[PDB]
Design a protein around this ligand. Structure first.
Ligand code: CAA
Ligand code: CAA
Lengths: 389, 389
């Protein structure tokens, strides 16, 4: 079998409380806490870009041996910093991976990490001793006082795909569905995306229904065959709606199971926000660590990308997977963050726009053990490397 | 076997004479004609963006049946018009391909089309009744009076990867090489790339030598085993230098053959210019149509992307391939172009920057049989479809 052998995520060291944001936006806190279903929003300091967040997510899961066996490094993102040079090249360099490897970026809104791991699996079919590093990294920025502001987030998820995976085996049953729609897009030149709220909800649910129907038809499967479903989520309230529209015809035993699985799947996302390409895989991490699924059981995953493309596929938990997760490290990562006021968040937000460095405000002295953007000279980004190196 | 079943290209209807450009830039025409090795530069009218050029290259090689069997549409480019929505979705829509397919963009400077076709092959290994559509589309724009201006170009190449290919079977011998270098890049916000001419040449040649060396070592092969080599062409003279750097240690018979093959390979490129991700594949088309290679003979290909990543692989000619090429249509495509003066070229260029439509200057009435950008309303691009539809 081939699948996810290692998985880990990284989010910046700051966050803003959703109830506080609500107060500053003149709305009932519950609108955010319950309406959209978010509790804390990740805030990006200027010294963390998609390159440093991606490297930080991958550094803890690649060993010296892995550095010699990784044949491809794929970065999925819709928050690129260069129009030509793939961020995968910089991360390949920063992580010290062997030179004979392919590095490139994949793009299609928040759907990109899925074809990356699926194709990584296909690439590995004939290479039992090779591995593939896939990194989903993004900064969901809508703008201050914008309609999507409450759903903002930032982070990166790193996955090592290989034979004899310790966590999840990817099955060969994926089915995608493409339909040209303008629910969310960001033309060249625009700092923030153009959104069509109401329309983005309909497109999202339709893509899911269409992909699931085709999948169920081709595999002769039904919801009852899944221990749990894991979806892409712009915010937890949106994911709940998509689930309810599909399990509307499932048995009661199945509905209780899938509804319960969902809450475990979006646990971590409630404290980070939308991280685009990484949202589905952060939810996957949450599900695996917060729920106690049994080995051999199957999970159904739905990946979505505005524009739009949807894909439904399944994976199977591998025996002993619990021993290969980093639950303590993950809870620690989220708990070790510092809450910032809304005014502070707004200052960070404005500085990120212009990439205005400030060693004091980002408190870089505390980041000795991680990768971070230290400066830009002659249009070249310079990164600080973990002290351990 | 799996490989290229069909391949076609499209360049815009205008071009500027290199000798004319030289005179306008106050330099010896031979500097451009012999020095860099370019005769005509493709000029982009505003009604041709990467989506329409890509659709125009694929339309002539997609049959009704193909539309039903294409399960993946991959667009390689470094000239994207949206930071989130993959241009593959628009092309998928324009070409009328069946809904159950994956659509996404791949990026890594001019290297992207290669991992696209290599992964498309790995993807098809277990899907016998499916095909993949790969489209490399770009507009190489450096800026009026810039250092790279003479090497500008625009166009797209479309390839259908399938089982039992009619033209080329892709072998399982690819080896890539990555090395972080700032020879050419374009930070977000920059209209034109930042280049380091001198450095970019050495980076190119080093990547080729490192890739070739590892490939020769792994496959136990030598240049003498190739009927011809085909490489990425920023401009024909650059490819000549790279080739000369390695055939030095080759027999007289092999040097004559590879030098001769090179001239055939860059024939079409002399009249188009650099088209980034599509350059290598345009050269491949040129080689196959202008030379008379025999079935079973092997071609060695070198793909390069600044940043940088290089890959060397081989493919074998399929018996009867000549009957599956479109030399007549290609010669006609290049011949039916209209030369524009340097003044007109500069007007077209400046208009392209701001996407300022001009039905008369772009002469859209002549474009009834092709796809083209007809307008942009509310940040949404509208395209005209061939009348035959
Ligand atoms: C972006 C991607 O990554 C791609 C995708 O998945 S597309 C998914 C959707 N798109 C996005 O996420 C883009 C950004 N989204 C947006 O534009 C907006 O954030 C949004 C439209 C999703 C919501 O913004 P909004 O309009 O201000 O809130 P609104 O839609 O009015 O509704 C707020 C919710 O809180 C509820 N609510 C209102 N006041 C409340 C209160 N006091 N207490 C509790 N609930 C309350 C409302 O009933 C509503 O829930 P429903 O789903 O039952 O209607
Ligand atoms: C961009 C990608 O897609 C990635 C790659 O492949 S990177 C590899 C190539 N890089 C690029 O294309 C980047 C963009 N290009 C550039 O920066 C520039 O166009 C360039 C550096 C390639 C050349 O620009 P230039 O400086 O104006 O021309 P210059 O370097 O002076 O030399 C012109 C050539 O014509 C020759 N020449 C000069 N006058 C001549 C004359 N009257 N008659 C004939 N030959 C003449 C020169 O000797 C020279 O040839 P060689 O050096 O190879 O012997």
């Amino acid at each position: 079998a081939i699948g996810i052998d290692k998985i880990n995520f990284y989010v910046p060291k700051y966050y803003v409380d959703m109830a506080k944001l609500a107060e500053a936006r003149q709305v009932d806190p519950n609108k955010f806490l319950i309406g959209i279903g978010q509790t804390e929003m990740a805030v990006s300091p200027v010294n963390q870009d998609i390159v440093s967040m991606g490297a930080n997510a991958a550094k803890d899961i690649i060993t010296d041996e892995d550095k010699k066996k990784i044949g491809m490094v794929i970065v999925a993102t819709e928050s690129a910093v260069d129009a030509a040079k793939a961020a995968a090249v910089q991360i390949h360099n920063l992580l010290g991976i062997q030179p004979f490897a392919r590095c490139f970026e994949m793009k299609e809104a928040c759907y990109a990490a899925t074809p990356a791991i699926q194709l990584a699996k296909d690439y590995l079919a004939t290479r039992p001793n090779e591995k593939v590093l896939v990194i989903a990294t993004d900064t969901a920025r809508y703008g201050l006082n914008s309609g999507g502001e409450p759903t903002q987030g930032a982070g990166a998820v790193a996955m090592v795909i290989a034979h004899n995976p310790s966590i999840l085996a990817l099955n060969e049953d994926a089915v995608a569905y493409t339909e040209d729609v303008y629910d969310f897009w960001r033309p060249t030149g625009h700092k923030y995306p153009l959104v069509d709220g109401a329309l983005s909800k309909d497109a999202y649910i339709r893509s899911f229904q269409q992909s699931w129907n085709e999948y169920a038809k081709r595999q002769g499967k039904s919801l009852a065959d899944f221990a749990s479903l894991c979806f892409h989520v712009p915010f937890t309230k949106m994911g709940k709606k998509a689930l309810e529209s599909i399990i509307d015809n499932a048995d009661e035993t199945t509905q209780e199971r899938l509804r319960s699985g969902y809450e475990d799947a979006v646990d971590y996302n409630r404290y980070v926000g939308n991280i685009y390409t990484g949202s589905l895989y952060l939810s996957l991490i949450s599900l695996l660590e917060n729920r106690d699924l049994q080995a051999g059981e199957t999970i159904g995953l739905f990946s979505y990308g505005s524009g739009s493309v949807g894909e439904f596929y399944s994976a199977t938990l591998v025996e002993g997977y619990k021993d290969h997760l980093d639950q303590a490290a993950h809870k620690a990562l989220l708990n070790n963050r510092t809450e910032v006021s809304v005014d502070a968040y707004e200052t960070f937000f404005k500085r990120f726009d212009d990439v205005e460095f400030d060693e004091e405000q980002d408190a870089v002295h505390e980041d000795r053990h991680i990768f971070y953007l230290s400066n830009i000279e002659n249009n070249v980004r310079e990164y600080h490397r973990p002290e351990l190196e």
